[PDB]
Design a protein around this ligand. Structure first.
Ligand SMILES: *[C@@H]1O[C@H](CO)[C@@H](O[C@@H]2O[C@H](CO)[C@@H](O[C@@H]3O[C@H](CO[C@H]4O[C@H](CO)[C@@H](O)[C@H](O)[C@@H]4O)[C@@H](O)[C@H](O[C@H]4O[C@H](CO)[C@@H](O)[C@H](O)[C@@H]4O)[C@@H]3O)[C@H](O)[C@H]2NC(C)=O)[C@H](O)[C@H]1NC(C)=O
Ligand SMILES: *[C@@H]1O[C@H](CO)[C@@H](O[C@@H]2O[C@H](CO)[C@@H](O[C@@H]3O[C@H](CO[C@H]4O[C@H](CO)[C@@H](O)[C@H](O)[C@@H]4O)[C@@H](O)[C@H](O[C@H]4O[C@H](CO)[C@@H](O)[C@H](O)[C@@H]4O)[C@@H]3O)[C@H](O)[C@H]2NC(C)=O)[C@H](O)[C@H]1NC(C)=O
Ligand SMILES: *[C@@H]1O[C@H](CO)[C@@H](O[C@@H]2O[C@H](CO)[C@@H](O[C@@H]3O[C@H](CO)[C@@H](O)[C@H](O)[C@@H]3O)[C@H](O)[C@H]2NC(C)=O)[C@H](O)[C@H]1NC(C)=O
Ligand SMILES: *[C@@H]1O[C@H](CO)[C@@H](O[C@@H]2O[C@H](CO)[C@@H](O[C@@H]3O[C@H](CO)[C@@H](O)[C@H](O)[C@@H]3O)[C@H](O)[C@H]2NC(C)=O)[C@H](O)[C@H]1NC(C)=O
Ligand SMILES: O=C(O)CC[C@H](NC(=O)NCC[C@H](NC(=O)CCNC(=O)c1ccc(I)cc1)C(=O)O)C(=O)O
Ligand SMILES: O=C(O)CC[C@H](NC(=O)NCC[C@H](NC(=O)CCNC(=O)c1ccc(I)cc1)C(=O)O)C(=O)O
Ligand SMILES: *[C@@H]1O[C@H](CO)[C@@H](O[C@@H]2O[C@H](CO)[C@@H](O)[C@H](O)[C@H]2NC(C)=O)[C@H](O)[C@H]1NC(C)=O
Ligand SMILES: *[C@@H]1O[C@H](CO)[C@@H](O[C@@H]2O[C@H](CO)[C@@H](O)[C@H](O)[C@H]2NC(C)=O)[C@H](O)[C@H]1NC(C)=O
Ligand SMILES: *[C@@H]1O[C@H](CO)[C@@H](O[C@@H]2O[C@H](CO)[C@@H](O)[C@H](O)[C@H]2NC(C)=O)[C@H](O)[C@H]1NC(C)=O
Ligand SMILES: *[C@@H]1O[C@H](CO)[C@@H](O[C@@H]2O[C@H](CO)[C@@H](O)[C@H](O)[C@H]2NC(C)=O)[C@H](O)[C@H]1NC(C)=O
Ligand SMILES: *[C@@H]1O[C@H](CO)[C@@H](O)[C@H](O)[C@H]1NC(C)=O
Ligand SMILES: *[C@@H]1O[C@H](CO)[C@@H](O)[C@H](O)[C@H]1NC(C)=O
Ligand SMILES: *[C@@H]1O[C@H](CO)[C@@H](O)[C@H](O)[C@H]1NC(C)=O
Ligand SMILES: *[C@@H]1O[C@H](CO)[C@@H](O)[C@H](O)[C@H]1NC(C)=O
Ligand SMILES: *[C@@H]1O[C@H](CO)[C@@H](O)[C@H](O)[C@H]1NC(C)=O
Ligand SMILES: *[C@@H]1O[C@H](CO)[C@@H](O)[C@H](O)[C@H]1NC(C)=O
Ligand SMILES: [Ca+2]
Ligand SMILES: [Ca+2]
Ligand SMILES: [Cl-]
Ligand SMILES: [Cl-]
Ligand SMILES: [Zn+2]
Ligand SMILES: [Zn+2]
Ligand SMILES: [Zn+2]
Ligand SMILES: [Zn+2]
Lengths: 696, 696
């Protein structure tokens, strides 16, 4: 038979390993020839694998690169202006790659050029609360200072935004061993830890969903009319550069001024972690100088778009997408995910060659320029927004398949919770000690849901990955899954060698997944989800699961507001309308579910009506006016946190209206805006509910 | 059989007459008890007529009313401050209605309160070009003057906006006999002309599609959070009041200053039409004083919403909608249209009682508060926007059925041109001299298309009517039709007694349509369109007709730009991308049309795919970012003219970027924005075309 089991059984660990090796021998930086070559290779292979059509979709977008003949670096300069200490110009290449060309040196993409020199202030992780603590509690002024922040906890773009608004004239990011060196594990190449010379690359934009900085709203095609740089979206105004902890140590060791306010401010280096500003007495006349000469330039990028036409509903699209561009070799990020996508295409293509086709169309995407701001997926979705919004069933992302070897991690819309539960109950656990048990069982045991015994944790979607346009802009149900670490063991924001030259094929093959069994489990979950979404007669979404979480989020936002009981009385702030809408959603969804079970199974119009109702339910949470000052975040239930693009926030409009409200100078105005956001959320919830009522 | 002919034949002129009489005996001003009573009556009757459900949808919206105990009026005051001349407090009521209560006196709805006193400037029709001529050519400064403008040519809201931006401190609108008195016809009650004491009511908002001024974006429901008045949308900042030509004569006769610049500035009164400012020598110390005391107040309004559930595609909606609220008796506007809707419901209900149902769902709407800014239809569409955008097939409007007795007038999306041509070829002409001929034949003869011999004129949709939210905001194919006058005979912007107390049942029965045959023809066209839209297996839209007009509009906008050849060279302004997109649209639409003809007629999925492609084609012209500073006008091909809300403009983004461009102080910036609009239009056209490509 051609069923899900045939699909799953065709997937092979050994194929994923071969593809990963193939994709990670040279760098594939967005906009470079090497990445265009790989694009053409994957196009060719997807065609040979059997897809009906495979095309490149190219765009001309703003990227950023260091100047090869004018290196970025930071100095300590003495009062004479002699540079007495200089940070590294490159990471020491790993064994056997010391002759690889075109390894981009560490840099912060989209930094402006400049050579600011000043006194250092240490700002911990540069989170909103870290700046609050500096200004409000410690009375330290960052205006005109160079800020040094440790990576971790939040997206680095938010750090840079926060430093700018504090008045910093430059930012230095570094990786502290506290956050990127797991105790008892060796540095690469002998373990999976970050060495003192390792550095995390990465962009520092604040795009808020816009895509290419020059063309917000519209694809960066041949004839596009670009904004000038001064009106581009999301560019930082101060120079920024990342360094490793050997170099960080040499910048921090001299710091004077105030002590760190508490231990949550101290990392693991042998330094006091003084906040500054500036250096202790003997060194007080020395300063820090950055030298940044990177350039922004419009550069062509290439997405690969594969189509497997549906047999019955070709005008319904289930999309499996993940990026192909990497900072250097991309051993984990993204090629561990791209190798999984490749094998999924291969497997679906095998069935197709034997005469099968999915019920609905499957689109496969190899996105470009993700590392420079989700540019490739966003431009493509801008180009294709009307097809995607009227035909898009679901989007399954496929970045890094592994970031650990402990258990599964899934973030998705509530509409996919039941699908994920049911699919994982069918799959075999790859975990030691769970031989012959289901993935559901191992996952639930290692990662229990905080709410419900006997179920696993599934998180909301955040951002910083290629689902952002499809979910928070366009309202297409989205999900993602990968293998991850035990967050109780270390609690780091990622894996140590993230975005470093040390992220290699050997990293994965030797330390993360020698038998490629976690990769295979991830291919089964991602591929399985796509299979069911594209082949189930009734779409596999359970609207009742949205009702349950909407109540949890309404409770949560209410509890936040209820910290201000006097203001709620003064300004008559009521959540009654939101709870009412949620109650109605619960009731209507329950009735819809009965019809879906009970409808006449011979009637394809009733079926498609109810599949359209299922498909357009995520779509109903979109507000076409967007959230305040973030027009490309239109989903009213979920947006990326305004303080950390990686994290999702629920009822974001209300949350941001309530955030730090006790500090606003005009409370009447501030609480007015809370009430406005309550109204918008209540209305959108009720409106979404009504899409599930009988249609006439 | 139950077919279109059965539907059409059930319609009776005598029923329309009875309903019109029934709807016009007392005033039905929005927000009054009398209009809520009529709402309940139409709800009851639509249920008895056989609709499946009929509900009221109510909203609480900003309306405006004069103060009953503090009348609005204008004076000429002498230097002592004695009011030596006062305009009327009411229109002399027509015969037999001199005892009717609650006739609202003439006023401009949403005027602020004030009693400004100043010198008069006469500004012709207060169009953009009239102000250009005053400031630029005649060097007359309106700052701090009271402006007197004749009604006509453009929507009165645009006049008030234009007067404000000229710095006027108040506006007086009047009806000039040149524009509202047809030569050789008697004044009401002895003819259909406006008497000297007649006055045109009407709102003076600039909403740009927003709906209720306090709640843009969201329905004005129970829990809505309102803007304060100072942030409301579209309210005028200067007092405004309309008067008749007896009173206008007494204001204009003393005017001094400059002569009218030419005869296009002179109306028909026995006055010189001097532009002013102020009065001639002997009267130079006299001034004009307005006294406006109207109040804005949030008031409940009621739409009636009738549903006739579709047998096969209940989740596809064909909407017939028109308003019910009137300024006074509403003899033409709107009850001549509402009486037609009522008979259409009756006819469809007769078929339903005999066991028939349309293929798709038909929604019938009796809108409220249209006269105060299309409020009722817009709030309802805001409430229901997600159902309408995913399920809305078409909207047919149904305001005034007649404004003359000469020939048909149709404005609609190009997608309905073929439908209208085919339907009118089936219908009998009611015109004298065309007995036994088709409506198509009489209409084509009396109103030839400017482009194509042997076809009739069909105009683009403008605004100032209840289709605005459905078409220009939501992108649902829309159309309207009514009987009209011979524009070659007089060329007035409407009919003389528009929005006056004299617009009565007797006006219609005695002067416009004694045998109710034009009303019946209009019921057949509107009802016929709804019938085909709701019952045709393939939706009756021809995408090729859009391709033909897109080329006409691209030629037109190109020709406008080509008046500035030097700037097009300097700033490299090319229309190549727009023409390219239009060419592609033409090619793809041609291929789609072949598939639509040729597809396998047994396959309902292919059918519905192609019906969805047809339905979502108007939808593809929507840009969710809206046009510049007009977020609720999102259609890129059509918007209401920025200079006259009643008129439609094509490629409005480009048109407004080019308008008066030779006056802009920064030409680089201005031509940049032209190019930006070219890109947006080319992209949207191509994107719309691609919705008609094979789906996978
Ligand atoms: C969750 O779902 C429920 C439905 O089960 C919704 O209930 C509606 O709630 C609103 C209140 O927010 C009710 O509004 C009230 O309607 C009365 C008239 O309703 C009748 O007539 C309408 C048509 O006009 C019918 O559709 C309806 O069935 C009724 O027969 C008004 O008279 C009320 O206004 C008066 O009282 C209020 C409050 O004290 C005053 O502010 C007013 O000035 C006025 O005096 C009121 O407008 C509505 O009728 C309910 N519909 C039902 C029960 O079907 C919830 O609203 C929904 N939650 C959300 C968030 O949408
Ligand atoms: C109306 O419809 C036609 C289709 O019939 C569209 O034609 C496309 O037009 C654009 C030009 O605007 C062409 O873009 C060019 O593509 C070249 C590569 O294309 C190949 O590879 C792609 C995938 O990457 C395939 O999809 C495609 O089939 C081709 O095989 C580029 O190399 C060109 O760029 C080079 O030249 C330009 C111009 O001189 C330079 O600016 C660049 O820097 C670079 O040197 C160019 O990008 C596109 O290929 C055409 N597609 C076709 C024929 O199918 C029209 O665009 C459309 N009109 C609108 C308004 O959309
Ligand atoms: C995940 O798996 C669960 C368990 O199989 C699925 O729920 C089950 O779905 C079936 C099929 O609809 C339900 O059967 C139905 O029962 C009703 C009422 O008794 C009957 O009238 C119908 O004819 C039909 O047989 C079954 O009750 C239900 N079991 C539950 C909820 O415990 C669930 O649908 C799956 N989720 C997906 C596919 O997203
Ligand atoms: C308005 O009426 C015209 C004239 O009836 C309609 O166009 C006609 O539509 C029919 C039905 O699709 C076309 O017939 C088809 O012809 C093709 C090609 O020869 C054949 O392969 C199909 O099987 C089918 O018989 C007919 O050609 C066409 N006539 C024209 C264009 O002159 C038009 O569709 C109507 N418009 C509407 C309903 O909106
Ligand atoms: O411009 C942008 O918006 C982002 C560009 C670029 N993106 C990435 O590097 N993405 C991979 C890293 C990303 N990290 C996080 O989400 C941090 C916390 N959550 C998880 O790791 C986490 C979340 C869900 C799951 I399932 C597993 C882990 C990730 O893991 O996706 C960057 O950040 O520089
Ligand atoms: O707030 C708003 O946006 C408008 C509120 C209110 N609306 C109306 O009174 N509508 C009826 C008058 C309107 N007039 C025009 O369109 C003027 C030129 N075109 C036609 O008459 C014309 C156009 C198409 C056809 I078919 C027939 C005649 C009309 O005729 O619909 C008002 O204007 O005060
Ligand atoms: C990755 O695998 C691809 C595909 O097998 C290899 O590209 C092929 O290389 C052979 C030998 O040079 C050529 O004859 C084919 O034309 C290539 N195929 C395609 C589709 O490009 C590639 O060599 C491998 N890369 C590495 C580094 O191993
Ligand atoms: C850090 O790098 C800087 C720049 O290369 C070094 O300073 C330069 O040294 C050369 C050779 O002695 C001089 O001719 C240049 O004028 C210097 N340039 C600047 C900008 O100062 C510096 O010596 C290096 N410091 C260390 C400790 O290696
Ligand atoms: C308009 O017609 C309606 C409906 O025929 C009339 O309203 C009815 O009046 C009778 C007699 O008063 C009542 O018994 C019914 O309950 C009413 N029906 C409904 C549905 O409201 C109304 O009288 C007519 N109005 C005018 C001015 O002629
Ligand atoms: C126009 O109306 C105004 C207001 O009614 C008249 O002026 C008033 O006249 C009364 C009675 O003589 C005075 O007591 C008021 O003080 C006046 N009010 C104002 C505001 O002036 C005026 O007489 C009327 N003019 C004409 C020509 O009829
Ligand atoms: C890079 O730096 C070099 C050498 O210092 C300079 O000549 C060149 O203009 C720079 N390239 C850029 C700005 O792309
Ligand atoms: C920080 O310093 C700058 C000037 O050096 C000043 O404008 C700003 O107000 C200061 N912030 C404080 C002390 O709050
Ligand atoms: C793989 O799992 C083992 C056993 O739990 C663990 O000790 C090791 O740290 C893991 N490797 C990685 C890279 O997480
Ligand atoms: C209307 O005018 C009267 C009498 O001059 C006044 O008492 C009342 O407040 C006004 N009503 C309003 C503003 O609605
Ligand atoms: C019109 O008059 C006002 C002041 O009375 C002035 O501010 C404005 O500039 C004048 N406009 C002209 C003469 O252009
Ligand atoms: C009705 O038609 C006649 C004959 O053409 C015309 O003279 C008369 O003015 C028309 N009535 C109206 C109200 O247009
Ligand atoms: Ca873009
Ligand atoms: Ca509103
Ligand atoms: Cl992922
Ligand atoms: Cl109309
Ligand atoms: Zn990645
Ligand atoms: Zn990455
Ligand atoms: Zn009207
Ligand atoms: Zn009107």
């Amino acid at each position: 038979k051609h069923n899900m089991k045939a699909f799953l059984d065709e997937l092979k660990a050994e194929n994923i390993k071969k593809f990963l090796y193939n994709f990670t021998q040279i760098p594939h930086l967005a906009g470079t020839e090497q990445n265009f070559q790989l694009a053409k290779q994957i196009q060719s292979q997807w065609k040979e694998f059997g897809l009906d059509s495979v095309e490149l979709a190219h765009y001309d977008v703003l990227l950023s690169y260091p100047n090869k003949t004018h290196p970025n670096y930071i100095s300590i300069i003495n009062e004479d202006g002699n540079e007495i200490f200089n940070t590294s110009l490159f990471e020491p290449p790993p064994p056997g790659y010391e002759n690889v060309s075109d390894i981009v040196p560490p840099f912060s993409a989209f930094s402006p050029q400049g050579m600011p020199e000043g006194d250092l202030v240490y700002v911990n992780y540069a989170r909103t609360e870290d700046f609050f603590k500096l200004e409000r509690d410690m009375k330290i002024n960052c205006s005109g200072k160079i800020v040094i922040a440790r990576y971790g906890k939040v997206f680095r773009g938010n750090k840079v935004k926060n430093a700018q608004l504090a008045g910093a004239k430059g930012v230095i990011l570094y990786s502290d061993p506290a956050d990127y060196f797991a105790p008892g594990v060796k540095s690469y190449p002998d373990g999976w830890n970050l060495p003192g010379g390792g550095v995390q690359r990465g962009n520092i934009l604040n795009l808020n969903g816009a895509g290419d900085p020059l063309t917000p709203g519209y694809p960066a095609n041949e004839y596009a009319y670009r904004r000038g740089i001064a009106e581009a979206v999301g560019l930082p105004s101060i120079p920024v550069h990342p360094i490793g902890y050997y170099d960080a140590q040499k910048l921090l060791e001299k710091m004077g001024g105030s002590a760190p306010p508490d231990s949550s401010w101290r990392g693991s280096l042998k330094v006091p972690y003084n906040v500054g500003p500036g250096f202790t007495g003997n060194f007080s006349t020395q300063k820090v100088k950055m030298h940044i000469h990177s350039t922004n330039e419009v550069t062509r990028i290439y997405n690969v778009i594969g189509t497997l036409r549906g047999a019955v509903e070709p005008d319904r699209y289930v999309i499996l997408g993940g990026h192909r561009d990497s900072w250097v070799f991309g051993g984990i990020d993204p090629q561990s995910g791209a190798a999984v996508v490749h094998e999924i295409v291969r497997s679906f293509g095998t069935l197709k060659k034997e005469g099968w086709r999915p019920r609905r169309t499957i689109l496969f995407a190899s996105w470009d320029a993700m590392e420079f701001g989700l540019l490739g997926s966003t431009e493509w979705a801008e180009e294709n927004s009307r097809l995607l919004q009227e035909r898009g069933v679901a989007y399954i992302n496929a970045d890094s398949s592994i970031e650990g070897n402990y258990t599964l991690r899934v973030d998705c819309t509530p509409l996919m919770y039941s699908l994920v539960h049911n699919l994982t109950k069918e799959l075999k656990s790859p975990d030691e000690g769970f031989e012959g048990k289901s993935l559901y069982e191992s996952w639930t045991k290692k990662s229990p849901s905080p709410e419900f015994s006997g179920m696993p944790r599934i998180s909301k979607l955040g951002s910083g990955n290629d689902f952002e346009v499809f979910f928070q802009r366009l309202g297409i149900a989205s999900g993602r899954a990968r293998y991850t670490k035990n967050w109780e063991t270390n609690k780091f924001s990622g894996y140590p060698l993230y975005h470093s030259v040390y992220e290699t094929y050997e990293l994965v093959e030797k330390f993360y997944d020698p038998m490629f069994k976690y990769h295979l489990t991830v291919a089964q979950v991602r591929g399985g989800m796509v299979f069911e979404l594209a082949n189930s007669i009734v779409l596999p979404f359970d609207c009742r699961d949205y009702a349950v979480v909407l109540r949890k989020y309404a409770d949560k936002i209410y509890s936040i507001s209820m910290k201000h009981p006097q203001e709620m009385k003064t300004y008559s702030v009521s959540f009654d309308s939101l709870f009412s809408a949620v109650k109605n959603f619960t009731e209507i969804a329950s009735k819809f579910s009965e019809r879906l079970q009970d409808f006449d199974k011979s009637n394809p119009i009733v079926l498609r009506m109810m599949n359209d109702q299922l498909m357009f339910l995520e779509r109903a949470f979109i507000d076409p006016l967007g959230l305040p000052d973030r027009p490309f975040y239109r989903h009213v239930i979920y947006a990326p946190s305004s303080h950390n693009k990686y994290a999702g926030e629920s009822f974001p409009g209300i949350y941001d209206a309530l955030f730090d409200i006790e500090s606003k100078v005009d409370p009447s105005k501030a609480w007015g805006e809370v009430k406005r956001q309550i109204y918008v959320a209540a209305f959108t919830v009720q409106a979404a509910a009504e899409t599930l009522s009988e249609v006439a």
